[PDB]
């Protein structure tokens, strides 16, 4: 049920203990010794990897290291479709913008934040929750020069349990961090958008980089006379597999929960955020969909943009499903009715105060929230010409000096970037008709962006006439309506572009709703530090984790599956048999690579396949993850590495607000599916040879 | 393989069931001199199966059986279909027209006599060994001089069974008076609708209840006032006990086809025209379907019928290639025939080798015809709508060619176009159809083989498929009303003559009528050689483990209560339960609409006795017992004959099951007795139901 800070290990080692943990507590977090949390990182900003050699291999998934292979590919050696094996160490590419962060310490700073703090003159600051505050006091509490006389490292500190307790991180920064290798992106994106949220799962979900340092194994950016990094702790790779009820443990870098949810927060992100989010995409995948079955070339300009729009779909979907069906409306009244009965009890009515803090500022932000989610959902993200070219203030100080000409190459540099070769006008003038036919009926006039008040006005309410006369009359509807523009341009034409007048009219409402709204996070953020205080104070620090927010925490469970519906029953492990019954040569999600379906028709699994034979691709645990999990190492009960977490079912969604155990499971790639592919699909032995493999 | 086996068949048999579970005597399931189980099971409405369950005649069977009778019964006032029917009194009971219930009264083996019979031969090659018309010449021979009339009610059958190597005699007694009793509501009796057609776990409440009238003696009338219902001499005890994991389970009923006896070329022949034609074809069809149901609301009334009729069939063709893909059923159809070759060889006979041959050759031949055939049915016959415009007669032509005959010419004529260009017919829909259907068609059938007519695609339209739709549509007679009724105003034979729409539709009826002809002689060389066939497979390994296919006759299958692993890491238990119909619940889904009493039953947990040990409401089971089209409505029997459930599906997995049953896929699709027993008691309210059956612990 937890994502535990690191300074609760040792309240929750005995549980731990009790579900199977043989490895002893300090092997594992130790907060002045070296321990296996010094092989976990932090990779590339939003995604969790583990060094895996005493050379600085690291593990991460294939989704997490796909922008360095796509930035390595190209037409004659494309790494994304085909893989990429680095067959010696001088051949690993190097990736500009590329980092890895080690947690080098962890302290509890909560009574030096909190004294720090007293020196207030406002009690509504918000300097509590202050990255700029707090950074002015870890840097007071690391000292002056802190990073010259550390090269390498960072200090920071976060506000957790809602600004109840502090903790200061000295960071380790590696830039130098290396692509080594890589399946296809039939092996690494097997399900590809299909299986996104999906138990079963086949996809081997993994990419191989390596850490590269000075001759002394501090950081340093790429230079092509760094040397791989010696690490102070890597793991070991178990080849004993899984087994049903085996105790595994995660650590890794969950982003956001939000466990601490009054009632009415949950009402407010279903019947706002998730249902406008629902509808709204409904319409404009719709869309997309019957345009892109109809014609060829559109599928093929439209699919990324297809896929992206579904997988916050899906999750909404999903979180969604829970609110309906695992009751976590009623489990936060229930939180919060005991809260206020124990607060009653004690004389102390300052926790009822903040829960009703709370209730009325969701209700009096609810026309605004909902009217934002409207246009963002249905006109920011839902039609592309609401992000064609605005001419900034410079550019029409130039239109009205020869200067004319460098304002016309920006603009139509803009107008390129919109119009790209994935853009469709036609494509696009349908989607915005029926996205702004679901707008209209749901935003009043009164509170319509300026330009869609002449839907009514001018357009007697024809939607397509309006969409028709933008692109019609429009410098942006065509490139030969630009080009005529270019050659004679005035500032009078843009002042009155349809195209430019609702671009600035949706991003003017989009821009004011937010302003308005801004305030509104204030009072529920000062009010959750009492309640949070509250809850603590009642029922303790064990069982109340702390709301996830990108950093270190572990999680504990078993290999588990579960059942999803009535009669309905997935195990808790898949095979290659799996991927092999999901082929399809016609559809590029189930491609399968031939060297693998080889490796499957001559059971060529060597010492990777299970006691009875069937080869491992994935397993599915009972340990609570959420985004930034992505790479997370899977260990054993002994600390031995058995896999890499990758996704979780869309029935756990909801889990990043109640955990839901029968429902909630994390999806791994099994450890010996890694080897598999780096043995027999990459033939990279010497990265099987650097790693410390276990019987 | 697993059985749909012949009544005589128990006697050899019954060691094995008894070792599977089966706990009854034998002669108390099937007695050949005497009153049995099997006299408590009738053919239902010419297709379906039902069961007497209790001493007043009352008979159940599925939901989607008595849905003809539910429908003929429903109007706006009281609309039986949507709401259920529960009639309170006896004297309620609605009667329906055309209804029939069979009762299998004696069966029995007369393959000496029609053997002998046959041996009065004039060519070897006669057909009349599996001909309807000269076995019944010999049923009647056999039963006597006016049978009819001095048994009334009763009738005689023989049928020919492994290929023409056994043949029994039925006595049948047939009641035509078979009364409406009672009917959940459609969102029970149908809650998958077509999602869950094929499906497994499934949630469906598939049942319904009539009642056998007759005179005053119990014999066989049409309907009357003064019928009284039937005393039956034996029906169904319901069980309440449920069921549990690998509990024996059996069946009886009347399965109608099976292919156990293909060759691996007909396997082959199977898959490669009459499956894949019928995919590639429907798939094309019900995707223009769909875009224009999807865009026009009135265009989804006026087709979701078509939609889901065609899609029928397009499953179970899409679950049988599934198998032949999957499950080695070309394979194990080639060492069948192997393994019987190798045999002949060894006894010196040549003529299963031969027979084999024979009918590979045979297929090798009909491939192009056949292709051709199931081309022009999948994607014209069935695939367009204006190919089933009218057609003027020899005699309407004729009409129309100085008499009064011509006014009642033009109103058949009229009633036709009224019948094609109905409520729910779109030219606007039919023409896009035609265009995708045509473009496949003339992809693959060449200029030479093409119906006459859409020779003029290449000829006249300069290849636009396009460009021939919309002229057939913009000149022809049936085109639209304003059109027919310019033509009926103004008739002339030499505008019918020469209308597109009338030339299109005989052209490609034409085709159709004359592909058939070429390819009906080729049943029969393979038809005999299958005679020779099945005897070599009998004498070699037996009548004890090869059933005969299917025909329409009373046959029993026993296997156990079982799931199944429909894929990797997924498991579906045995048993579904009503929590599975609440989690399936969508009130703006027609389909998945909860009824309000039932919802409130699951929300109190008003099960009664009707709840399993853990107090969960059982809905529907599955078991490894063979049946196929034609078991709807079987009972399903205890290891002590007593009724657990009625079947009503099968799953997609085990389509290919008529060809070769798959023990780790293949399952019956049952509703649980207790879920049947719940609706009638807490959503219909009609005890006298549950008081006339004889309902045990
Ligand atoms: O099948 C579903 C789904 C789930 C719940 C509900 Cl209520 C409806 C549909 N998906 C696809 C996988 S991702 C989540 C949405
Ligand atoms: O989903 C399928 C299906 C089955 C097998 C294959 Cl190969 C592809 C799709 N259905 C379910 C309804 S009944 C049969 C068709
Ligand atoms: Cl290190
Ligand atoms: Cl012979
Ligand atoms: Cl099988």
């Given at each position: 049920?937890?994502?535990?800070?690191?300074?609760?290990?040792?309240?929750?080692?005995?549980?731990?203990?009790?579900?199977?943990?043989?490895?002893?507590?300090?092997?594992?977090?130790?907060?002045?010794?070296?321990?296996?949390?010094?092989?976990?990182?932090?990779?590339?900003?939003?995604?969790?990897?583990?060094?895996?050699?005493?050379?600085?291999?690291?593990?991460?998934?294939?989704?997490?290291?796909?922008?360095?292979?796509?930035?390595?590919?190209?037409?004659?050696?494309?790494?994304?479709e085909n893989g990429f094996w680095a067959m010696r160490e001088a051949d690993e590419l190097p990736n500009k913008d590329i980092s890895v962060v080690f947690i080098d310490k962890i302290e509890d700073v909560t009574d030096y934040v909190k004294k720090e703090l007293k020196a207030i003159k406002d009690p509504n600051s918000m300097d509590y929750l202050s990255p700029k505050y707090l950074q002015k006091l870890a840097d007071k509490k690391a000292g002056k020069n802190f990073s010259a006389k550390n090269p390498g490292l960072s200090v920071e500190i976060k506000a957790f349990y809602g600004g109840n307790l502090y903790l200061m991180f000295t960071k380790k920064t590696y830039t130098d961090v290396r692509?080594?290798?890589?399946?296809?992106?039939?092996?690494?994106?097997?399900?590809?958008?299909?299986?996104?949220?999906?138990?079963?799962?086949?996809?081997?979900?993994?990419?191989?980089?390596?850490?590269?340092?000075?001759?002394?194994?501090?950081?340093?950016?790429?230079?092509?006379?760094?040397?791989?990094?010696?690490?102070?702790?890597?793991?070991?790779?178990?080849?004993?597999?899984?087994?049903?009820?085996?105790?595994?443990?995660?650590?890794?870098?969950?982003?956001?929960?939000?466990?601490?949810?009054?009632?009415?927060?949950?009402?407010?992100?279903?019947?706002?955020?998730?249902?406008?989010?629902?509808?709204?995409?409904?319409?404009?995948?719709?869309?997309?969909?019957?345009?892109?079955?109809?014609?060829?070339?559109?599928?093929?300009?439209?699919?990324?943009?297809?896929?992206?729009?579904?997988?916050?779909?899906?999750?909404?979907?999903?979180?969604?499903?829970?609110?309906?069906?695992?009751?976590?409306?009623?489990?936060?009244?229930?939180?919060?009715?005991?809260?206020?009965?124990?607060?009653?009890?004690?004389?102390?009515?300052?926790?009822?105060?903040?829960?009703?803090?709370?209730?009325?500022?969701?209700?009096?932000?609810?026309?605004?929230?909902?009217?934002?989610?409207?246009?963002?959902?249905?006109?920011?993200?839902?039609?592309?010409?609401?992000?064609?070219?605005?001419?900034?203030?410079?550019?029409?100080?130039?239109?009205?000096?020869?200067?004319?000409?460098?304002?016309?190459?920006?603009?139509?540099?803009?107008?390129?970037?919109?119009?790209?070769?994935?853009?469709?006008?036609?494509?696009?003038?349908?989607?915005?008709?029926?996205?702004?036919?679901?707008?209209?009926?749901?935003?009043?006039?009164?509170?319509?962006?300026?330009?869609?008040?002449?839907?009514?006005?001018?357009?007697?309410?024809?939607?397509?006439?309006?969409?028709?006369?933008?692109?019609?009359?429009?410098?942006?509807?065509?490139?030969?309506?630009?080009?005529?523009?270019?050659?004679?341009?005035?500032?009078?034409?843009?002042?009155?572009?349809?195209?430019?007048?609702?671009?600035?009219?949706?991003?003017?409402?989009?821009?004011?709703?937010?302003?308005?709204?801004?305030?509104?996070?204030?009072?529920?953020?000062?009010?959750?530090?009492?309640?949070?205080?509250?809850?603590?104070?009642?029922?303790?620090?064990?069982?109340?984790?702390?709301?996830?927010?990108?950093?270190?925490?572990?999680?504990?469970?078993?290999?588990?599956?579960?059942?999803?519906?009535?009669?309905?029953?997935?195990?808790?492990?898949?095979?290659?048999?799996?991927?092999?019954?999901?082929?399809?040569?016609?559809?590029?999600?189930?491609?399968?690579?031939?060297?693998?379906?080889?490796?499957?028709?001559?059971?060529?699994?060597?010492?990777?396949?299970?006691?009875?034979?069937?080869?491992?691709?994935?397993?599915?645990?009972?340990?609570?993850?959420?985004?930034?999990?992505?790479?997370?190492?899977?260990?054993?009960?002994?600390?031995?590495?058995?896999?890499?977490?990758?996704?979780?079912?869309?029935?756990?969604?909801?889990?990043?607000?109640?955990?839901?155990?029968?429902?909630?499971?994390?999806?791994?790639?099994?450890?010996?599916?890694?080897?598999?592919?780096?043995?027999?699909?990459?033939?990279?032995?010497?990265?099987?040879?650097?790693?410390?493999?276990?019987?």
């Amino acid at each position: 049920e937890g994502m535990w800070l690191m300074q609760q290990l040792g309240r929750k080692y005995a549980q731990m203990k009790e579900r199977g943990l043989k490895m002893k507590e300090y092997d594992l977090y130790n907060p002045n010794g070296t321990s296996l949390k010094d092989a976990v990182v932090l990779f590339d900003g939003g995604c969790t990897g583990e060094v895996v050699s005493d050379r600085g291999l690291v593990l991460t998934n294939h989704h997490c290291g796909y922008d360095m292979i796509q930035a390595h590919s190209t037409l004659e050696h494309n790494y994304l479709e085909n893989g990429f094996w680095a067959m010696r160490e001088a051949d690993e590419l190097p990736n500009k913008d590329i980092s890895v962060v080690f947690i080098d310490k962890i302290e509890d700073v909560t009574d030096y934040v909190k004294k720090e703090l007293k020196a207030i003159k406002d009690p509504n600051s918000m300097d509590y929750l202050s990255p700029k505050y707090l950074q002015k006091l870890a840097d007071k509490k690391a000292g002056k020069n802190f990073s010259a006389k550390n090269p390498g490292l960072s200090v920071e500190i976060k506000a957790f349990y809602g600004g109840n307790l502090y903790l200061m991180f000295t960071k380790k920064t590696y830039t130098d961090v290396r692509l080594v290798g890589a399946p296809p992106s039939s092996i690494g994106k097997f399900g590809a958008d299909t299986d996104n949220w999906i138990w079963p799962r086949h996809t081997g979900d993994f990419s191989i980089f390596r850490i590269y340092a000075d001759k002394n194994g501090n950081p340093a950016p790429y230079s092509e006379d760094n040397v791989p990094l010696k690490p102070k702790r890597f793991f070991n790779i178990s080849l004993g597999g899984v087994q049903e009820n085996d105790y595994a443990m995660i650590m890794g870098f969950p982003g956001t929960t939000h466990r601490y949810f009054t009632a009415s927060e949950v009402d407010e992100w279903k019947s706002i955020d998730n249902d406008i989010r629902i509808r709204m995409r409904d319409i404009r995948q719709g869309v997309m969909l019957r345009e892109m079955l109809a014609d060829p070339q559109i599928k093929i300009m439209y699919s990324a943009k297809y896929a992206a729009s579904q997988n916050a779909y899906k999750r909404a979907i999903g979180a969604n499903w829970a609110i309906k069906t695992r009751g976590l409306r009623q489990n936060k009244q229930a939180m919060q009715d005991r809260l206020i009965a124990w607060g009653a009890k004690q004389g102390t009515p300052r926790y009822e105060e903040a829960v009703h803090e709370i209730d009325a500022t969701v209700a009096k932000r609810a026309d605004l929230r909902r009217r934002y989610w409207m246009i963002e959902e249905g006109i920011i993200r839902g039609i592309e010409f609401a992000r064609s070219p605005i001419p900034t203030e410079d550019e029409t100080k130039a239109l009205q000096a020869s200067a004319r000409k460098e304002a016309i190459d920006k603009i139509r540099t803009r107008y390129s970037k919109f119009a790209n070769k994935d853009y469709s006008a036609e494509v696009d003038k349908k989607v915005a008709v029926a996205m702004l036919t679901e707008y209209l009926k749901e935003i009043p006039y009164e509170n319509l962006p300026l330009h869609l008040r002449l839907v009514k006005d001018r357009f007697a309410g024809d939607v397509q006439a309006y969409v028709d006369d933008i692109f019609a009359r429009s410098v942006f509807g065509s490139e030969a309506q630009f080009d005529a523009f270019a050659a004679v341009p005035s500032v009078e034409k843009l002042a009155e572009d349809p195209m430019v007048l609702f671009a600035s009219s949706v991003f003017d409402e989009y821009r004011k709703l937010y302003n308005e709204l801004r305030p509104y996070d204030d009072p529920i953020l000062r009010a959750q530090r009492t309640y949070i205080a509250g809850l603590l104070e009642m029922d303790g620090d064990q069982d109340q984790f702390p709301d996830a927010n990108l950093t270190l925490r572990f999680t504990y469970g078993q290999v588990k599956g579960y059942s999803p519906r009535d009669n309905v029953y997935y195990g808790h492990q898949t095979t290659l048999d799996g991927v092999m019954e999901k082929e399809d040569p016609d559809n590029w999600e189930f491609v399968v690579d031939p060297k693998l379906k080889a490796v499957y028709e001559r059971k060529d699994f060597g010492r990777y396949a299970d006691r009875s034979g069937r080869m491992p691709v994935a397993f599915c645990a009972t340990t609570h993850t959420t985004g930034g999990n992505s790479g997370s190492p899977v260990m054993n009960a002994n600390g031995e590495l058995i896999g890499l977490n990758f996704d979780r079912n869309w029935e756990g969604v909801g889990g990043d607000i109640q955990y839901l155990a029968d429902y909630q499971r994390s999806i791994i790639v099994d450890i010996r599916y890694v080897l598999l592919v780096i043995d027999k699909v990459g033939g990279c032995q010497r990265l099987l040879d650097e790693m410390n493999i276990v019987p």
